[PDB]
Design a protein around this nucleic acid. Structure first.
Ligand SMILES: [Mg+2]
Ligand SMILES: [Mg+2]
Lengths: 145, 195, 68, 189, 55, 75, 104, 144, 143
RNA sequence: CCGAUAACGAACGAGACUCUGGCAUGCUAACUAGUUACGCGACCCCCGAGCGGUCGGCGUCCCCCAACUUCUUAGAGGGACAAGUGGCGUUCAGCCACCCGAGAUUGAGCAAUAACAGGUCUGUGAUGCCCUUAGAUGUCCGGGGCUGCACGCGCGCUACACUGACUGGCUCAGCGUGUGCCUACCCUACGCCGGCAGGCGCGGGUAACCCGUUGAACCCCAUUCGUGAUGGGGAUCGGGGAUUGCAAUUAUUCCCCAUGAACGAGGAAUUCCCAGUAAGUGCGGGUCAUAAGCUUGCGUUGAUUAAGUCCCUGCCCUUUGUACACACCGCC
C-alpha cells in the first residue's frame, strides 16, 4: 500500500554475474541483465506469477531464484521457441535464451568462427567496418577520427 | 466488362493512337502538304480525314497511295478488315496553316533560296492570305559556324494568357542541311470570324 | 488598394457613355444590364468593371464637364 | 454569466493601468466559455487586441515545434494552471493573469543598429500592444524554461510564473527579463 | 550467338523489360494509365494525346 | 543540484512528515509532493491517492497529465 | 416487349457532352420516351506531374498536365421496344457512347 | 398540434466538414449521430457545442428535436460544423415558422456573441507548390 | 428510460462490459495471451492481465456500432502508429490472430453471429446484453 | 492610370484571359448519391407512455411499389464593381475606414524585346563533323563495379524527452490508384491457419457500383514511468522466420528476440516564411517483381510576429561621372 520501505529490502542485488538496482520496478530492473529485454523480462515475470507493480528490492529470495530459473530454463515454462535469442544454434542446434557472460562468449564465438572461415562478414568484423552492407563513405567517422 | 479496358486507359489509348497516327502521317506526307489529322471514331467503323494542301498528290495513281496508307494503318493498329477508311480534305486558305508554311519554307531553303528572301516571301504570303499577324523565326548555322537566329514579325502577335491557345497556330520544323539543322518556328495569329 | 482601371475599361466606358448617355444612369445594377446589349463584352468581370466605372463617370458628369 | 472554464466570472476583473485597458480583452464582449475561438485575428492590424487574452496566452504557449498545432492540450494546460493559481491565491485567476501581464510588460527598450553604441544603441519607448505581446511571450518562455527538464508540470510552472509576475516578487523569469530590458534602456538613454 | 543464349536472360521485369513506345528509351518512363512513354516524349505529345496545362 | 536520488519508498522519518504537514498547505500535486519530500513521484502519486482514500485530502481535477489536491476546509 | 436501356456518354469537353445529352433527351421527349434525368458521374482528373527540363539542369520546375474526363448517363423507358424506336446516336467527335441493357 | 412537415434541414460547414441539422417540432431534444450532445469525445471543446443553448436558453430549445449528421473533416471541424448547424437550423426554423420579431432577436444575439455561429468560415486550404514542403514554404537552398 | 450504448460513456462502457465478461467466466481465452503483443507496431505487451476481456468488450461494442466487420476490419480499427525507429513513422494494422480469436470467442459466446455475406454482427441476445450493460452504466452514472 | 506635353496614332508585355476555392435551401437532375417519411423488424424502457430511444438492419425502379434535392455529384446561370457611406486627394486618377455581404488582395497556369558560348549529342529512327565498325566503341551472355572509406560539404530523417514515452479505450479525412497491345507484374473484401511477417481457399471490382461509410496519424480520455543517458534515442551488432526474383553474399524488403552508441537543444555562419500560412501529423501518386528517409499532391491540428524600411542583400526609374564596352570578376 506504498507504506514505508520493508526492512528486508535489498537495494543492490547480485543476480548472475551482473548487478541490478533495486530501486526500479522488477520488470525493468531485471533488464539490466545482458540478454534480457523488456519483452523477455515481462514474459518471465508473467510466468513466475509475481506482482509486476512491486519493486525488485522488495522481492524475496525464493521469488528471486524462481525468476532466475525461469530465465535460465524458458523452454520448460511454455515460453515459445520463436521468442528466444539463440534459436537454432549454429553449433548444436538447440533453442535457448542465453543471458549471461555466456551471451558475450557466443557473440565472440560467432565472430571468431567467421574470422576463421574467412567469410566476407568475418573480414569486415576484423577490419572493424560495417557488416550489414551499408554505405561507409560519409557515416561512422567517429570510430576512426 | 473485364475484357474492356477502363475509361482512363481507354481515353489515354485513344490519345496515344491519335499521336502515333499524326507522327506517322507527318513523316510520310510532309512533302505532300500534310497539315493535320481528324478522326471521328464510331464503333461500327472509323474514318480518318487527312487535312492536306496537295490532296491530289496525296491521292496516288487511282488512289493507290491512299489504299497503301489505309492498309498500313489497318495492319499497324489491328483494325478489323474494312473497318477503317481514310479520306483526304483540302485545307481552305492554306496560308493560315502554320504547319503548311513550315514545309513551304523548308522546301525553299532546301531548294537553295536565300533565307531572308524565303522568310520574307512566306511572311508576305501569310499576310496576303489574311491574318492578324505572323512571326517566323529561323535558327541555326546561318552563314558562319557560329549559330544565329533571324526573327521576322509583322502585325499582331499575342504571347500570354488563354487566348494564345486558340488564336495562334504554332509550328516547329527541322531542316537538314549539309552544315547541320535549321529550326523553323512559325506562329500565325488567326483572324476572328463568327463563321 | 490596387483598384486602378486600365485603358480597356476606361476607353470603353467613355465611348458607351458618349453613345448611350440618355439610357445610362446612376444605378450600377442597371448600368450592368444596359451594358449587356449596348456592347459585346466577352467577360462578366470586364462588363461589371466597365459598369462600375460608368456609374463613377456619370456621378462625375452630373456635376462637371468630364472629357467624355 | 459566462464563467470561463465553467467558473471565475470575468466582470469582476479591473484593469490596473489606463495604458493597457484598450488592449487587455477580458470583459463584456471578451467573455467566452473557452479560449479556442479561431476567428481570423491576423487578417488586419490591431485586430488581435480584440482577441481575448486567454486565447492569446493559449496561442503563445504552444511553441518549439514539438507542439505547434496542439491547441487542445494548451487549453487544458491553461485550465489547470488557472485551477492551481486560484487554489494558491484565493482570488480570481483572470485578475492574477491581468496583473501578471501588467507587471511583466516592459515599459522601455533599446533599438537602432548604429555600430552598437553602448548596449544596443538608442533607447525607445514601447507601444501598449507590444507591451502585451512581450508580456505574454515572456510568461510563456518563463513557464517553458521552468518546466523543461524537471518533474514540475507545465501547469504548475505556468501557475507559479503567473503568480510571481502578478505579485512582482522578481522571482519570475518574465520580471527578471523585463528588469534587464529596462536597465539596458536606461543605459542606452 | 546461337538460340540457346542470345536472349536467354529473363526480361519479365525491371528496367530492361520496359522501354519507351516512341524513342525506345529505358529512363524516365511513365507507366501511369498505360502510357509507356518517355519523360520527354510525353512533353512532346501531351497536347496530341489530350493532356493540357490547366494550372 | 546534480542528482536527486529520490526515495522510491517511504521510511518512518518521511511518512511521519507526510502525515503531519502535507495536509497543511493549499496545493497538493505529485510533483510538489515529490519535490518537498525528496520522494520518487510515482510513490507520491500512490501516497496522495492513499490519503484521498483515507479521506483527509480533497481532489479537484484528476486528469491524466495532472492531478490536483487540496486541504480540507476548517470551520 | 419491355426493355431497359442505359446510355452512358463519356467525353473530355463539357460542351460536346452537354450537347449530345441534350439532343438525345430532346429526341426521346419528342417521341414521348420516359427519360430518366441526366445524371453526372464525378469528373475524373488524370494528373501527370513531370520535370519541365529534359536534362535535369535548372531550378527544378515541374509541369502539371491535366486530363478531364466527364461522364453522364441516361435511362430510357417505354412500354415498347426502344432500339427500333431510336437507332441513330446523333453524336459529334470527341464523345463515346455506351448502350447497355439492364440484364448486364 | 399535429402539423405535418414541421421540420427544417440546415447544414453547416468548416474545413470540408459538413454537419446537417434536422430540426423538427417536438420535445426539447438534441443529438448528433444518434449520440447525446454532452457525449462528445473531445470534452475539451464541450462548451463550444454548449454555446448555442447556453446563449439562447433551454426554453428556446424546449420545442425542437434536433438530429445532427456530420460526415467530414477532423475533430474540431466536426465540432464547429455541428454548432453552426444547430444555430442555423434553429434560426431557420424560427424564420419559417414563427415571427421575425423572434427570429431577429435570436439572430442578433448569436451573431453578436460569435459570427461563426451563423456564417461559414470561407478559408479551406492552399495547394502545395513544386519547390517546397508546403503551400508557401520553400526547400532550404545552399550556395557552397 | 430506454437507454442505448450510444447514450452512455463509451470509455466506461467498455470497462464495465469487460468486467461483465470477467464475471461470466464463459469466454474462451487462448493460452498465449500472456506472450503476444497486440500488434506488430507495439513495442510492449499490454499491461492489463484482462486485455483479452477488454478487447472482446471493444469488439462487441464496435459490432454494435456497425455490423459486417471482419478480421481485416478489426485490424484496421485497432491499428496504429509504427515509429519505425530512425525511419519516418507510418500506420500498421492490428494482429489478425488476436482479432480472429476474439471474434471466434464472441461467436462461441453466442453474442455474435455471421452475416449472409462476410463479416459478423451482434445477435439479438448480444444486443440485449449490450443494452443491459448500457442500462447499468447509465444507472451507475446517475447515482 | 490621371494629367503636362513636339508629338500623334498604335503594337507587345502588365492587365484582361483559363483552371481552381469560397456563396447560392434559386433552376436542372439523380438505385453507380443520398435525405426525410412510412411499413416490417432487432434491442431498451416498461410504472406508462409509444408520434418513446438506437440501428451503415430490411424494404417502398425487385416498376406501380413514397416524396424531395438541404446534405453528395455537376451543368447552365447569377453573385463583387472600390458598388454604398464618411474622410483625404487638383477633388482627377485614386487612397484610408466603415456598413451590407459568402466573398472588399484565394491560389495557380500562361507570360514581351534582347541575350547567356548557362544545361542537355546519356530522350529521340533530332542532327553537322570526327572516331569505331568483326580480336567492334555494334549487340548478346557470365561475373564484378556503380554502395567501395584516414576525411570535407550539401539536401533530409530521427532525436536529445514528463507540453513526454509505454499500455489500453474512444474518435474524426481528402486527394487519388487499382487486372497490363507489346509486357510476364492490379486493388483487395470475407473465412481458416500462425505470435508476426505471412500462408491457404473463396469472391468483388476495368470501377460515385468492390476495396470503401477509405474506422489514417496527430489529437482526446484512462494506466505505468519520475528528471537519471531513465520505459528518452534506436545507431551498431548476433541468432532465427518469411516474402519477391533466375539469382538476396557486399546484409532487397518485412517479422521476432537480444545490444541500447553518440545525442542533455548545438560556434562562426545561414535557409524558409504573413493566414488555414509556418510548424506538428499522417495518407495517396511517381519510381515499384521487391520496395521511400526522395519528390509530387492531399487532408488533419494550427499559431507567434508585421501591415514597415532601405540598414545589409539586391531590383526598377531619373540625374550624374567615367580613361569601362570581354562592359568593375572592367581598366590601369
Ligand atoms: Mg496575365
Ligand atoms: Mg521501454
Amino acid at each position: 500500500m506504498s507504506l514505508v520501505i520493508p526492512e528486508k529490502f535489498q537495494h543492490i542485488l547480485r543476480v548472475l554475474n551482473t548487478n541490478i538496482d533495486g530501486r526500479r520496478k522488477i520488470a525493468f530492473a531485471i533488464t539490466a541483465i545482458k540478454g534480457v529485454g523488456r519483452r523477455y523480462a515481462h514474459v518471465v515475470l508473467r510466468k513466475a506469477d509475481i506482482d509486476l507493480t512491486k519493486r525488485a528490492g522488495e522481492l524475496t529470495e525464493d521469488e528471486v531464484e524462481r525468476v532466475i530459473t525461469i530465465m535460465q530454463n524458458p523452454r520448460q515454462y511454455k515460453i515459445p521457441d520463436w521468442f528466444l535469442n539463440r534459436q537454432k544454434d549454429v553449433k548444436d542446434g538447440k533453442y535457448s535464451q542465453v543471458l549471461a557472460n555466456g551471451l558475450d562468449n557466443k557473440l565472440r564465438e560467432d565472430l571468431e568462427r567467421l574470422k576463421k572461415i574467412r567469410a566476407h562478414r568475418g573480414l569486415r568484423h576484423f577490419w572493424g567496418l560495417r557488416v550489414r552492407g551499408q554505405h561507409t563513405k560519409t557515416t561512422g567517422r567517429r570510430g576512426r577520427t | 466488362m473485364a475484357v474492356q479496358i477502363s475509361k482512363k486507359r481507354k481515353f489515354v489509348a485513344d490519345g496515344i493512337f491519335k499521336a502515333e497516327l499524326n507522327e506517322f502521317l507527318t513523316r510520310e506526307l510532309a512533302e505532300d502538304g500534310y497539315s493535320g489529322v481528324e478522326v471521328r471514331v464510331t464503333p461500327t467503323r472509323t474514318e480518318i480525314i487527312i487535312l492536306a494542301t496537295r490532296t491530289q498528290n496525296v491521292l496516288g495513281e487511282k488512289g493507290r497511295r491512299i489504299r497503301e496508307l489505309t492498309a498500313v494503318v489497318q495492319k499497324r493498329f489491328g483494325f478489323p478488315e474494312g473497318s477503317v477508311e481514310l479520306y483526304a480534305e483540302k485545307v481552305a486558305t492554306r496560308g493560315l496553316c502554320a504547319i503548311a508554311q513550315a514545309e513551304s519554307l523548308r522546301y525553299k531553303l532546301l531548294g537553295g533560296l536565300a533565307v531572308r528572301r524565303a522568310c520574307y516571301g512566306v511572311l508576305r504570303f501569310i499576310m496576303e492570305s489574311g491574318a492578324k499577324g505572323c512571326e517566323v523565326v529561323v535558327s541555326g548555322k546561318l552563314r558562319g559556324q557560329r549559330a544565329k537566329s533571324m526573327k521576322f514579325v509583322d502585325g499582331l502577335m499575342i504571347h500570354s494568357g488563354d487566348p494564345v491557345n486558340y488564336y495562334v497556330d504554332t509550328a516547329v520544323r527541322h531542316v537538314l542541311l549539309r552544315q547541320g539543322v535549321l529550326g523553323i518556328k512559325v506562329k500565325i495569329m488567326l483572324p476572328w470570324d463568327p463563321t | 488598394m490596387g483598384r486602378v482601371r486600365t485603358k480597356t475599361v476606361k476607353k470603353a466606358a467613355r465611348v458607351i457613355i458618349e453613345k448611350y448617355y440618355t439610357r445610362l444612369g446612376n444605378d450600377f445594377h442597371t448600368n450592368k444590364r444596359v451594358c449587356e446589349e449596348i456592347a459585346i463584352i466577352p467577360s462578366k468581370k470586364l462588363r461589371n468593371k466597365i459598369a462600375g466605372y460608368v456609374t463613377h463617370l456619370m456621378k462625375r458628369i452630373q456635376r462637371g464637364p468630364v472629357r467624355g | 454569466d459566462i464563467k470561463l472554464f465553467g467558473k471565475w466570472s470575468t466582470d469582476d476583473v479591473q484593469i490596473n493601468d489606463i495604458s493597457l485597458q484598450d488592449y487587455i480583452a477580458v470583459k463584456e464582449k471578451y467573455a467566452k466559455y473557452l479560449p479556442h475561438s479561431a476567428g481570423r485575428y491576423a487578417a488586419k492590424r490591431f485586430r488581435k487586441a480584440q482577441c481575448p487574452i486567454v486565447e492569446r496566452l493559449t496561442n503563445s504557449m504552444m511553441m518549439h515545434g514539438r507542439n505547434n498545432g496542439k491547441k487542445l492540450m494548451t487549453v487544458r494546460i491553461v485550465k489547470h494552471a488557472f485551477e492551481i493559481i486560484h487554489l494558491l491565491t484565493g482570488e480570481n485567476p483572470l485578475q492574477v493573469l491581468v496583473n501578471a501581464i501588467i507587471n511583466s510588460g516592459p515599459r522601455e527598450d533599446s533599438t537602432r543598429i548604429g555600430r552598437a553604441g553602448t548596449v544596443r544603441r538608442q533607447a525607445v519607448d514601447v507601444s501598449p500592444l507590444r507591451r502585451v505581446n512581450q508580456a505574454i511571450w515572456l510568461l510563456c518562455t518563463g513557464a517553458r524554461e521552468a518546466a523543461f527538464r524537471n518533474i514540475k508540470t507545465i501547469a504548475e510552472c505556468l501557475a507559479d510564473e503567473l503568480i510571481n509576475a502578478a505579485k512582482g516578487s522578481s522571482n519570475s523569469y518574465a520580471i527578471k527579463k523585463k528588469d534587464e530590458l529596462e536597465r539596458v534602456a536606461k543605459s542606452n538613454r | 550467338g546461337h538460340q540457346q543464349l542470345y536472349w536467354s536472360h529473363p526480361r519479365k521485369f525491371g528496367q530492361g523489360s520496359r522501354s519507351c513506345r516512341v524513342c525506345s528509351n529505358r529512363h524516365g518512363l511513365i507507366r501511369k494509365y498505360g502510357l509507356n512513354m518517355c519523360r520527354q516524349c510525353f512533353r512532346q505529345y501531351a497536347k496530341d494525346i489530350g493532356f493540357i496545362k490547366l494550372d | 543540484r546534480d542528482k536527486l536520488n529520490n526515495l522510491v519508498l517511504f521510511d518512518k522519518a518521511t511518512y511521519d512528515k507526510l502525515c503531519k504537514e502535507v495536509p497543511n498547505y493549499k496545493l497538493i500535486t505529485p510533483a510538489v509532493v515529490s519535490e518537498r519530500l525528496k520522494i520518487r513521484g510515482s510513490l507520491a502519486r500512490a501516497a496522495l491517492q492513499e490519503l484521498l482514500s483515507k479521506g483527509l485530502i480533497k481532489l479537484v481535477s484528476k486528469h491524466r497529465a495532472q492531478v490536483i489536491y487540496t486541504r480540507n476546509t476548517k470551520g | 416487349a419491355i426493355h431497359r436501356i442505359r446510355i452512358t456518354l463519356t467525353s473530355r469537353n463539357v460542351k460536346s457532352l452537354e450537347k449530345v445529352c441534350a439532343d438525345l433527351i430532346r429526341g426521346a421527349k419528342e417521341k414521348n420516351l420516359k427519360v430518366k434525368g441526366p445524371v453526372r458521374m464525378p469528373t475524373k482528373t488524370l494528373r501527370i506531374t513531370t520535370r519541365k527540363t529534359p536534362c535535369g539542369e535548372g531550378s527544378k520546375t515541374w509541369d502539371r498536365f491535366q486530363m478531364r474526363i466527364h461522364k453522364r448517363l441516361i435511362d430510357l423507358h417505354s412500354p415498347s421496344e426502344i432500339v427500333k424506336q431510336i437507332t441513330s446516336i446523333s453524336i459529334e467527335p470527341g464523345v463515346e457512347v455506351e448502350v447497355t441493357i439492364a440484364d448486364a | 398540434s399535429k402539423g405535418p412537415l414541421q421540420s427544417v434541414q440546415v447544414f453547416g460547414r468548416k474545413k470540408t466538414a459538413t454537419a446537417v441539422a434536422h430540426c423538427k417540432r417536438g420535445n426539447g431534444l438534441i443529438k448528433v449521430n444518434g449520440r447525446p450532445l454532452e457525449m462528445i469525445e473531445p470534452r475539451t471543446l464541450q462548451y463550444k457545442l454548449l454555446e448555442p443553448v447556453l446563449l439562447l436558453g433551454k426554453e428556446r430549445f424546449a420545442g425542437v428535436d434536433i438530429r445532427v449528421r456530420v460526415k467530414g473533416g477532423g475533430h474540431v471541424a466536426q465540432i464547429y460544423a455541428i454548432r453552426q448547424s444547430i444555430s442555423k437550423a434553429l434560426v431557420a426554423y424560427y424564420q419559417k415558422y414563427v415571427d421575425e420579431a423572434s427570429k431577429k432577436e435570436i439572430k442578433d444575439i448569436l451573431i453578436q456573441y460569435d459570427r461563426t455561429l451563423l456564417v461559414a468560415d470561407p478559408r479551406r486550404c492552399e495547394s502545395k507548390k513544386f519547390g517546397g514542403p508546403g503551400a508557401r514554404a520553400r526547400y532550404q537552398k545552399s550556395y557552397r | 428510460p430506454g437507454v442505448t450504448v450510444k447514450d452512455v460513456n463509451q470509455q466506461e462502457f467498455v470497462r464495465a462490459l469487460a468486467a461483465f465478461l470477467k464475471k461470466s467466466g464463459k469466454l474462451k481465452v487462448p493460452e498465449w495471451v500472456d506472450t503476444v503483443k497486440l500488434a506488430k507496431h507495439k513495442e510492449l505487451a499490454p499491461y492489463d492481465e484482462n486485455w483479452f476481456y477488454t478487447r472482446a468488450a471493444s469488439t462487441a461494442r464496435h459490432l454494435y456500432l456497425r455490423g459486417g466487420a471482419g478480421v481485416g476490419s478489426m485490424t484496421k480499427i485497432y491499428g496504429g502508429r509504427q515509429r519505425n525507429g530512425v525511419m519516418p513513422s507510418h500506420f500498421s494494422r492490428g494482429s489478425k490472430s488476436v482479432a480472429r480469436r476474439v471474434l471466434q470467442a464472441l461467436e462461441g459466446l453466442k453474442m455474435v453471429e455471421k452475416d449472409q455475406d462476410g463479416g459478423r454482427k451482434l445477435t439479438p441476445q448480444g444486443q440485449r446484453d449490450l443494452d443491459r450493460i448500457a442500462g447499468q452504466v447509465a444507472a451507475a452514472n446517475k447515482k
